[PDB]
Amino acid sequence: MNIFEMLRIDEGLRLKIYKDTEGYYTIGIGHLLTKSPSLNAAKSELDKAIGRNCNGVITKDEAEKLFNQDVAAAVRGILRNAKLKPVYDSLDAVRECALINMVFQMGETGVAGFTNSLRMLQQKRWDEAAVNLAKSRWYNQTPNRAKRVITTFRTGTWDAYKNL
Ligand SMILES: [Cl-]
Ligand SMILES: [Cl-]
Ligand SMILES: [Cl-]
Ligand SMILES: [Cl-]
Ligand SMILES: [Rb+]
Ligand SMILES: [Rb+]
Ligand SMILES: [Rb+]
Ligand SMILES: [Rb+]
Ligand SMILES: [Rb+]
Secondary structure (H helix, E strand, O other): OOHHHHHHHHHOOEEEEEEOOOOOEEEEOOEEOOOOOOHHHHHHHHHHHHOOOOOOEOOHHHHHHHHHHHHHHHHHHHHOOOOHHHHHHHOOHHHHHHHHHHHHHHOHHHHHOOHHHHHHHHHOOHHHHHHHHOOOHHHHHOHHHHHHHHHHHHHOOOOOOOOO
């Protein structure tokens, strides 16, 4: 396991624009294009992201290209975020993947708002953090994915992803 394989399990791979679990236009491996309800707005975002006239369809190589950009940018953003950087640096490499996963799904601002859970993680109070993380819109709306991420935080193992 690693962050790419983890997020590939959680996000899937689709080569045509589709709506994510929130109803938002997405493509590839969880690449959010826009929150606009306009498919045309989403198609414009896509073409700009890829650098060609895609009309809503990409290749697997292109999907992987956006995915590595998105993972790299999630890590870089965490390290530039005053709330998330200390927690990231305090965590072992497996638990860091859980944090990257959350940022990938909900964005930096959203994760940075989990003040109490972040403190528990920094304190290495793993079972307490796991309890707290579940008390969230996040968990309610995507409970099975959140369970996997939370198990990763609680245990520092890949048990919730082996073999998905
Ligand atoms: Cl982009
Ligand atoms: Cl604990
Ligand atoms: Cl709690
Ligand atoms: Cl889910
Ligand atoms: Rb997805
Ligand atoms: Rb629409
Ligand atoms: Rb670390
Ligand atoms: Rb994403
Ligand atoms: Rb907060």
